[PDB]
């Protein structure tokens, strides 16, 4: 099991890698975490980069195997909220190229804004 501090630290390291690769702006990322969804390609490709790095998205598709391995590494306060969100969002990975991860991410946020922890 991971602590919340390790989760925030690993999230920060993923952002440090994925933001320069995609040139998403700080405000675009900040908007996303408040439910303001910019479908600009940079925001979309950032979400693709993040979820590929987490191994949750592979070739534009939700990898339900990676989802199951990593659920036991979640802090228990996120375990229940994540299960419900993945169940609700497991077909939201629609579209082309970076769109599936972005659409999946928007779904995850809207299913439970308070428990959303993606970078």
Query: How are the strands of the biggest sheet laid out side by side?
Result: 1-2
The share of residues in extended strands comes to under 5%
The profile of the biggest β sheet is: 2 strands, antiparallel
Total number of distinct structural domains:
1
**Structure class:** mainly alpha
Radius of gyration: 13 Å
The proportion of residues forming helix, as a percent range, comes to 55-70%
Helices, by number, come to: 6
- Give the termini distance in whole angstroms: 19 Å
PDB class: structural protein
Keywords: Chrysopa pallens (Rambur), odorant binding protein 4, structural protein
Assembly: monomeric
Entry title: Crystal Structure of Odorant Binding Protein 4 in the Natural Predator Chrysopa pallens
What would you say about this model in short?
Belongs to the PBP/GOBP family. The protein has 119 residues and is mainly α.
Top keywords for this entry?
monomer; 119 residues; mainly alpha; two-stranded antiparallel sheet; structural protein; Chrysopa pallens (Rambur); odorant binding protein 4; monomeric
């Amino acid at each position: 099991m991971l602590t919340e501090a390790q989760m925030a630290s690993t999230a920060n390291l993923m952002r440090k890698m994925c933001q320069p690769k995609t040139k998403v702006t700080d405000e675009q990322i900040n908007n996303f975490h408040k439910g303001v969804f910019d479908d600009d390609k940079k925001m979309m490709c950032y979400m693709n980069c993040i979820l590929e790095t987490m191994k949750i998205i592979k070739n534009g598709k939700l990898d339900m195997s990676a989802v199951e391995q990593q659920m036991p590494t979640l802090p228990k306060k996120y375990q229940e909220s994540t299960k419900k969100s993945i169940e609700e969002c497991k077909s939201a990975d629609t579209g082309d190229k970076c769109e599936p991860a972005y659409n999946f991410a928007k779904c995850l946020y809207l299913s439970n804004p308070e428990m959303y922890f993606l970078p």
